Structure formats: structure tokens, C-alpha cells
Amino acid sequence: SAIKPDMKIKLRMEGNVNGHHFVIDGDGTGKPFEGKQSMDLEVKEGGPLPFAFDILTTAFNRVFAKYPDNIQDYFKQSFPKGYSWERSLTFEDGGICIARNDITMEGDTFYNKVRFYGTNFPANGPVMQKKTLKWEPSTEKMYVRDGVLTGDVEMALLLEGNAHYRCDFRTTYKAKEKGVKLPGAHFVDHCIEILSHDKDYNKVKLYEHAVAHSG
């Protein structure tokens, strides 16, 4: 196995939300076979961010997901060459984001080149007013569409005032090496949490747990 039970994670994200530019670095570790990863993030440019940090967090690698023997593990089978993903986030108030990650591996470390672009958030909305609290746990549906592994999930951001703010995610996943076999349709249960932060979310510790299953 290319992938060891403990791996390091290095990341840089560049992006722009509603005209606001930012650069964010990450340094993390995780346990691919237990489906657990954590990361320390530090905003390097454009802080303090004028939008909810929460919109970014799922952009900060499905290799960290516990797969049973009876489902093909496309992600772990992608290494050492790696894979890329592309995601659209469609929020219920018209906000739209486009994100991508190109994932490589050198030794015991995954490198992630992330881009994140968002637009059309209303100035008076929960994202630009910083009113969000957390993503609710949920279930990604994995299937193949015209030869491309695709994951769909309807996600919910819990807002102050006990309301949710809904968002449809679609991610396409593609191995760098041709001939990695596609999996059959399945589910991935996942939960992402902000574990700690400083005053303006310039330094943040992030955690994700993810488990694949057949229903």
C-alpha cells in the first residue's frame, strides 16, 4: 500500500468571494483507513475575512474515509499519482461557489492546490453578515455519470436564530492515472467541525470524519 496509516497534509488555497481576495495555508495530519483528518489553517493574505469562514471548510480529500472491503475505494487506488476534484456549491439565496483541488503525494505527505471562487452572496445575507454556526452532518451519494464519479449532497448550514441555510453540493472526482476502475454507487456519511478559532477566524483548527457504506 502507497498510503500509510498516518499521513501528513500540506495545503494552500487561493480565492476570491464577492470580490474579496485571500490566501490560506494549512498543515494537518490524518488516518486514511480510519476516515479521520484534522488541519490547522492560517489566513496569510486578505484577513480578517469579511464572510463566514464556514463556506470554505469542505474545500480544506476523500482518501480520508473508511471504506469497507465490499466497495471499490477509488481514492486510495488513485495514489501515488493522485486525483483532482471539482465542486459546485449552490446556496438557496443565489450565492454560488466553484472550488477545485489538485491532490498529489510525496512520501508520507499529501499536497493540495485549492482554488475557491464565490459570487452573488447578498450583502445582507448570513454569509456576508457572518451569521453561520456549523454544517449539519450529512450523506454524500456517490454514482457514476457519463463515465465520471460524482458525489451529490444537500447540505444545511445552521444559522443563528435556529434557522438553516441550504446548499446543494455536486463534486466530480477524477484519478490522474487512466484505467483506475470506477466504483459502484454508494454513500459517504460525513461530519465537519471547527474545533477552535481565534477572534476573526485568522487561525482555525478543522476536523472531518467520513465513513463509506451501502445504505
Automatic annotation (TrEMBL):
Chain positions found as Cysteine sulfenic acid (-SOH): C167
Gene3D superfamilies: 3.30.1300.40, Green fluorescent protein (2.40.155.10)
Entry's Gene Ontology BP terms: bioluminescence; generation of precursor metabolites and energy
Pfam families: GFP
Keyword Membrane: no
Keyword terms, alphabetized: Chromophore, Luminescence, Photoprotein
Listed SUPFAM superfamilies: GFP-like (SSF54511)
UniProt keyword Glycosyltransferase present: no
Origin superkingdom: Eukaryota
Modified residues (Phenylalanine amide): F60
Homology family: Belongs to the GFP family.
This protein's name: Green to red photoconvertible GFP-like protein EosFP
Source organism: Lobophyllia hemprichii (Lobed brain coral)
